[PDB]
Amino acid sequence: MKLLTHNLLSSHVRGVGSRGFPLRLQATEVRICPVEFNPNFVARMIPKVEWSAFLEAADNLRLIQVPKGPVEGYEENEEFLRTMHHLLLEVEVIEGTLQCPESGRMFPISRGIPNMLLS
């Protein structure tokens, strides 16, 4: 599971109703997996990321110097897009858990795949 995928899984549309909460990520096994850089895609994704949930997850994977939000001019900032590409798409959770905020139940990630069923 990539961090962009965690962000989508965790997401809620913010509106006039109360805040929704992300799945809390823990990992026991992580791998780095190069993905071909698509700066057009990453730039499209920047405004769609739920940044607080991304920061929490990244911190739990011991990622460092993580951008704290969208930078000035980010569509023209190749370094920021390259950094976000890596953090969103190339850091894969192989073994871990996603914890549901409303129940406290753990949903396992195994072989990179989150199992969201209520077994």
């Binding site: 990539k2 995928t5 989508l8 997401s11 997996c33 057009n40 895609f41 795949i113 969201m116 069923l117």
Partner: protein, 207 residues
């Protein structure tokens, strides 16, 4: 630029289910079906390149594999069966496709999950009755909630009017873009005059 025949050739190399589960209507999307469907999505509608795409009932991954080769930023496959997903992962690794992820879940129980999180949703859903309606209609409801721009799906041509009626009720634009036929697994032919194949519509839903 991937031409139609090249795409179909590649999709013939996607391995299928090791022990397909009949109750889940497990069969791979057929290579000619997948190739024509994805080639249209990309070249006619531009609904794949640089997009985030969901493949509901992704199975062994034919539709996702093709989507990932057509320039998607990320294709996420969703399936209820872990054994299907193991095969899909193997297939992605064989093709060296790393703009893919996958998730085990029940697509019919995704209310309020990943709302408007995907550009495009694509699927070849099951047709079995689930709580009084086709499983494909449950998949459709989920797909429309998840997708921002477009849903592409295969529905029985015999159910066309019903699909059209639900789209109107939902205020969804509907366009029937092709009439297709493909073979079901031989084991599905359980009465004498049951056809071996199924007639489906490729349908584009949009907002």
């Amino acid at each position: 630029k991937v031409r139609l025949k090249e795409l179909e050739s590649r999709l013939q190399q996607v391995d299928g289910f090791e022990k397909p589960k009949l109750l889940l209507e497990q069969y791979p999307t057929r290579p000619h079906i997948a190739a024509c469907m994805l080639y249209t999505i990309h070249n006619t509608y531009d609904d794949i390149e640089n997009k985030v795409v969901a493949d509901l009932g992704c199975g062994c991954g034919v539709l996702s594999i093709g989507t990932a080769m057509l320039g998607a930023g990320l294709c996420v496959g969703f399936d209820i069966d872990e054994d299907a997903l193991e095969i899909f992962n193997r297939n992605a690794e064989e093709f060296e496709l790393t703009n893919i992820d996958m998730v085990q879940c029940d697509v019919c129980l995704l209310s309020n999950r990943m709302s408007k999180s995907f550009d495009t949703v694509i699927m070849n859903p099951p047709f079995g009755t689930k709580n009084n309606k086709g499983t494909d209609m449950a998949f459709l409801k989920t797909a429309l909630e998840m997708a921002r721009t477009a849903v592409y799906s295969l529905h029985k041509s015999s159910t066309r009017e019903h699909v059209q009626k639900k789209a109107a009720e939902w205020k969804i634009k509907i366009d029937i873009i092709a009439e297709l036929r493909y073979d079901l697994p031989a084991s599905y032919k359980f009465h004498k005059k049951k056809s071996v194949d199924i007639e489906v519509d490729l349908i584009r839903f949009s907002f």
